[PDB]
């Protein structure tokens, strides 16, 4: 069984190291990392590559040998390293949830106010909060209370003997982030549903309003110099070449509707004809007339359930047993706890498959940087 465990944990470490290391080098060779949206994924891979290369290997050695043979200093260094890193990925999931939440509730205000300097600073807070929350307590609670409670040869968080400090830090690391992430992604699911009907009624109102009134209102909004719309025009124009791709993939009747509308938009400037064309296609595709709304809402439901259940099914068994143990010490037999402590690292090997490999730009550069072609 030691050979079976060593093989299965070794493959998960090789898969995690290869999965995250390739993600870091995918957009270094590829000139498409001029995106602050991918900064959070780039930093997420930094924490998960640390877990894959350094945490799974030193934990599997801790269980297979049934012993920590690297000394107390390496135990505290590993414990601080993987608790801060797993926490950093958790608050990079919270940072990503907050970024996606404010890009759907305030798509214009948030994007205009978000700059590469600001996004990088936000990542700095996700790592600084993780650092302060975990590194001081793990590395020095044996000096806050002057005694090394951790058993020699064992390696666990040394302050978990405290009954209220454990509850507090489990709230700040898992419970509050889980409720905040669940609520934020719940409002994301609802906002996606509202965006279905909203865009549908807007698509109706393009028909009612004459095109000249829409054009004159576009000029009346693009003349008043506002940084909210100046960025919006550049973003809309930039994604025009890959927005007409979905026009071919649109409905048969809807394709003729777009073709007729762009015919009237002929002889118009590039910053106004392409800006107007994006609005019509956005409400045409995502309007969800009869069943497209259900398909898109369920698509979001499946993606969000997979993203969230990769958090509950990976972290809740660990955190539930920590809280339960604080009430009844003689509970949750050790075999259950051991499997649940390893189970947390399963998020680090699946996270690249949920946010990086889910993108179309990724999952294709991987083959270019792995097949050497």
């Amino acid at each position: 069984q030691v050979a079976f465990i060593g093989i299965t944990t070794g493959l998960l470490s090789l898969a995690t190291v290869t999965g995250n290391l390739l993600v870091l080098i995918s957009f270094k060779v590829n000139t498409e990392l001029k995106t602050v949206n991918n900064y959070f994924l780039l930093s997420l891979a930094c924490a998960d590559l640390i877990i894959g290369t350094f945490s799974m290997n030193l934990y599997t050695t801790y269980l297979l040998m049934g012993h920590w043979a690297l000394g107390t200093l390496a135990c505290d260094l590993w414990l601080a390293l993987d608790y801060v890193a797993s926490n950093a990925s958790v608050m990079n999931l919270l940072l990503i949830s907050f970024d996606r939440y404010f890009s759907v509730t305030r798509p214009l205000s948030y994007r205009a106010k978000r700059t590469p300097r600001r996004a990088a600073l936000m990542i700095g807070l996700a790592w600084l909060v993780s650092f302060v929350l975990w590194a001081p307590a793990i590395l020095f609670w044996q000096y806050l209370v002057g005694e090394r409670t951790v058993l020699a040869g064992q390696c666990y968080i040394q302050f978990l003997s405290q009954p209220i400090i454990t509850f507090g830090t489990a709230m700040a690391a898992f419970y509050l982030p889980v409720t905040v992430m669940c609520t934020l992604y719940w409002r994301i699911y609802r906002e996606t549903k509202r965006a279905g009907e909203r865009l549908a009624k807007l698509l109706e109102k393009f028909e009612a309003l004459p095109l000249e009134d829409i054009v004159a209102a576009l000029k009346a909004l693009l003349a008043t110099n506002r940084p909210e719309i100046q960025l919006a025009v550049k973003t809309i124009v930039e994604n025009f070449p890959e927005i007409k791709k979905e026009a071919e993939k649109l409905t048969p009747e809807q394709k003729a509707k777009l073709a007729a509308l762009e015919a009237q938009l002929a002889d118009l400037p590039e910053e106004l004809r392409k800006v107007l064309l994006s609005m019509y296609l956005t409400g045409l595709l995502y309007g969800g007339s009869e069943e497209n709304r259900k398909r898109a809402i369920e698509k979001a439901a499946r993606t969000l359930s997979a993203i969230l259940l990769a958090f509950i099914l990976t972290w809740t068994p660990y955190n539930i047993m920590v809280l339960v143990s604080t009430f009844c010490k003689d509970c949750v037999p050790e075999t259950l706890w051991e499997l649940g402590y390893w189970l947390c690292y399963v998020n680090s090997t699946i996270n690249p498959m949920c946010y990086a490999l889910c993108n179309k730009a990724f999952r294709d550069t991987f083959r270019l940087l792995l097949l050497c072609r």
């Binding site: 807007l202 209102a217 956005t282 995502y286």
Partner: peptide
């Protein structure tokens, strides 16, 4: 006409809305 501009501020707001959702593969 104020009602037309605030219509455009909503349609443009939702064009960025679905474009951001596409960037997250969430729609």
């Amino acid at each position: 006409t104020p009602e037309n501009i605030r219509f455009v501020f909503a349609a443009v707001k939702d064009t960025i809305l679905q474009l951001n959702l596409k960037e997250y593969n969430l729609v």
